[PDB]
Design a protein around this ligand. Structure first.
Ligand SMILES: Cc1c(=O)n(C)c(Nc2ccc(I)cc2F)c2c(=O)n(C3CC3)c(=O)n(-c3cccc(NC(=O)CCOCCOCCNC(=O)CCC4=[N+]5C(=Cc6ccc(-c7ccc[nH]7)n6[B-]5(F)F)C=C4)c3)c12
Ligand SMILES: Nc1ncnc2c1ncn2[C@@H]1O[C@H](COP(=O)(O)OP(=O)(O)NP(=O)(O)O)[C@@H](O)[C@H]1O
Ligand SMILES: Nc1ncnc2c1ncn2[C@@H]1O[C@H](COP(=O)(O)OP(=O)(O)NP(=O)(O)O)[C@@H](O)[C@H]1O
Lengths: 303, 277
């Protein structure tokens, strides 16, 4: 639960935050769109990413908000993207974080066809150890694990982002987006009590989407797997009542197939918990593997 | 192809526009003068003749409405791309803002009354063949016992749904939607083609009745995807957790009934609300 090559990069990040101090709108110059923007801080030669959530509420709440997003200063990990500061401007709270030049895994999967099993083995450790950090050292669960919020870079780190720290920002956001891909656990959909087991399922279903190259609900028939119009409620009712999705028997090792099957168990008590997955054959095998992640990244993305 | 303001029976010499009354998803709502009035300006595409003739179909209906629990439709001038709808201005606060003010007593006799006013108003709009399609406490006004419904029929022509493959859902909307509707929300759904009915409007009254006693919306804790599944399959709260008797809680079971035909008319509901203690 500790490396030293990893210990240099975090000590290198803790020094880059001494450089910024405090923040305000005129400090930042828009570079590119990513809602989030890749922006150029001028008081510090550090390219950040800024997320801008629109909120319209009275001042006693926006200060209660920023106080709760101060927690991300304290949390620091090689499997969690770096938090700098959180300030309010122009009817929008802005969170500036570490920028990551490879993007989310859902856009690298968008450009690649499918992600080969060996790479998916590393990321699971990232995710596995990522979430285990916040449950053990902060008593928070992520609440929104999905491909769009797993970030990669040309240096080869993988970290999580976009997680549920501020219970009042949860309440203050006015409207939510729902689409054809849901990553919500069947126990959350049904309104019953939930723990980090929901994030494990959200990881399982993310892993089979990335290994197949298609969101796996509803499951494809034999015609679409050989070559490799629905309403929200029937997708969600499929997720609760139909047997969970599963990797194709032929092309993936039996350790991997089981690894997702154990994440995609419906009963959250029988589902694998955080460190049952730490000792699973599939991640013991990938741990002691040498994959050049940065190499596969820069080669298929083009950077 | 146009609607002039002299086409109305309200005598109109001059119209003044004041400050903005509030933010809203559908056009803007200004203060006005005519007496004092509420001007809702909305924008359309220059040449979308199919949605504009559909809008004239609406307002001709409202020209016939007058009822003391329904906001007074006064006029509506349509010279594209700019349109306005002019109703009288409501003194006082929204039922939404009254429900959420700690300083305000909401006893079980008074909530039984505020619900009866909405029901009367809603019987009247049904009587005339007008579905509301967006009944909610932010579209009911309350001021010392007078209760006015606003924004009826707007949702048809509204466009409050408009990202890619991702339907924008605002907090509070889904828990007013009867299941026949919830089961059909897609990222392709359009407001003009959702199956509203007199039954879906009664459902939405149920959500106000819950809200009157709970002093918050139902499904307040849960995420949106959770709400869609729970409500599509029939799962509804009750009011026993805050000590409301059988009869206050029997209202909800009738209004929120899963099969539409089991939900009352507004006339029947008016009778059921008279029989409370
Ligand atoms: C929250 C959220 C956020 O903060 N930031 C800061 C965001 N930005 C951001 C963050 C990091 C970084 I690097 C960079 C960033 F840009 C985001 C954000 O960017 N985006 C995306 C881009 C737009 C978000 O989408 N969201 C967001 C995320 C997750 C969820 C949501 N929405 C919902 O979930 C809606 C449904 O409503 C949930 C209501 O739940 C409130 C919490 N109530 C509980 O848990 C009660 C549980 C309970 N417990 C009991 C007893 C005990 C005993 C012990 C414990 C316990 C457990 C653990 C400790 N003790 N318990 B017990 F469990 F408390 C009894 C009951 C929205 C963002
Ligand atoms: N730190 C970051 N660096 C680079 N790209 C990012 C970063 N954070 C988010 N993005 C990208 O910005 C886009 C939107 O991200 P995000 O704000 O998380 O919304 P989303 O991915 O569509 N779903 P959600 O995270 O729940 O809002 C995606 O294309 C992400 O890959
Ligand atoms: N007749 C009226 N008299 C006074 N205020 C009004 C009237 N009609 C609307 N308003 C206010 O004008 C603003 C915009 O109205 P509207 O667009 O219906 O918002 P809303 O119905 O409250 N919320 P939403 O429909 O979810 O966007 C709100 O502050 C309303 O309370």
């Amino acid at each position: 639960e500790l490396d030293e090559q990893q210990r240099k990069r975090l000590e290198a990040f803790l020094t880059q935050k001494q450089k910024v101090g405090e923040l305000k709108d005129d400090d930042f110059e828009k570079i590119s769109e990513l809602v989030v923007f890749k922006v150029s801080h001028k008081p510090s030669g550090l390219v950040m990413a800024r997320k801008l959530i629109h909120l319209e509420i009275k001042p006693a709440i926006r200060n209660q908000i920023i106080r709760e997003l101060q927690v991300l200063h304290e949390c620091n990990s090689p499997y969690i993207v770096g938090f700098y500061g959180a300030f309010y401007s122009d009817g929008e709270i802005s969170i500036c974080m570490e920028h990551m030049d490879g993007g989310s895994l859902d856009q690298v999967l968008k450009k690649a066809g499918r992600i080969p099993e060996q790479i998916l083995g590393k990321v699971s450790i990232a995710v596995i150890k990522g979430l285990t950090y916040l449950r053990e050292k902060h008593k928070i669960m992520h609440r929104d694990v999905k491909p769009s919020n797993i970030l990669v870079n040309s240096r080869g780190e993988i970290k999580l982002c976009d997680f549920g720290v501020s219970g009042q920002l949860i309440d203050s956001m006015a409207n939510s987006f729902v689409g054809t891909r849901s990553y919500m656990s069947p126990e959350r959909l049904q309104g019953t009590h939930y723990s980090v087991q929901s994030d494990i399922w959200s990881m399982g279903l993310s892993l089979v989407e990335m290994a197949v190259g298609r969101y796996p609900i509803p499951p494809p028939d034999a015609k679409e797997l050989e070559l490799m119009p629905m309403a929200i409620f029937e997708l969600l009712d499929y997720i609760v009542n139909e047997p969970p999705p599963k990797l194709p028997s032929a092309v993936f090792s039996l350790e991997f197939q089981d690894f997702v099957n154990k994440c995609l168990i419906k009963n959250p008590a029988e589902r694998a918990d955080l460190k049952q997955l730490m000792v699973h054959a599939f991640i013991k095998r990938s741990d002691a593997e040498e994959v050049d992640f940065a190499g596969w990244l820069c080669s298929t993305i083009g950077l | 192809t146009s609607i002039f303001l002299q086409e109305w029976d309200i005598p109109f010499e001059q119209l003044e526009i004041g400050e903005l009354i509030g933010k809203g998803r559908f056009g803007q709502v200004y203060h006005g003068r005519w007496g004092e009035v509420a001007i809702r300006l909305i924008d359309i595409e220059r040449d979308n003749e199919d949605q504009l003739k559909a809008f004239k179909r609406e307002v001709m209906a409202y020209r016939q409405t007058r009822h003391e629990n329904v906001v007074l439709f006064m006029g509506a001038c349509m010279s594209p791309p700019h349109l306005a709808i002019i109703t009288s201005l409501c003194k006082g606060r929204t039922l939404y803002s009254v429900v959420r003010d700690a300083k305000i007593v909401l006893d079980v006799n008074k909530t039984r009354q505020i619900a009866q006013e909405i029901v009367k108003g809603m019987g009247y709009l049904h009587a005339k063949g007008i579905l509301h399609k967006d009944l909610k406490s932010k579209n009911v006004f309350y001021d010392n016992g007078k209760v006015v419904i606003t924004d009826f029929g707007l949702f048809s022509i509204s466009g409050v749904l408009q990202r890619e493959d991702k339907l924008r859902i605002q907090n509070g909307w889904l828990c007013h939607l009867a299941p026949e509707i919830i089961r059909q929300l897609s990222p392709d759904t359009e407001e003009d083609k959702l199956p509203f009915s007199k039954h879906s409007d009664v459902f939405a009254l149920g959500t106000i009745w819950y809200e009157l006693h709970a002093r918050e919306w139902p499904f307040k804790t849960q995420p949106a995807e959770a709400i869609i599944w729970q409500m599509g399959t029939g799962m509804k709260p009750n009011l026993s957790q805050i000590g409301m008797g059988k009869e206050i809680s029997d209202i909800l079971l009738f209004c929120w009934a899963f099969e539409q035909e089991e939900r009352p008319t507004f006339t029947k509901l008016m009778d059921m609300l008279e029989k409370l203690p």
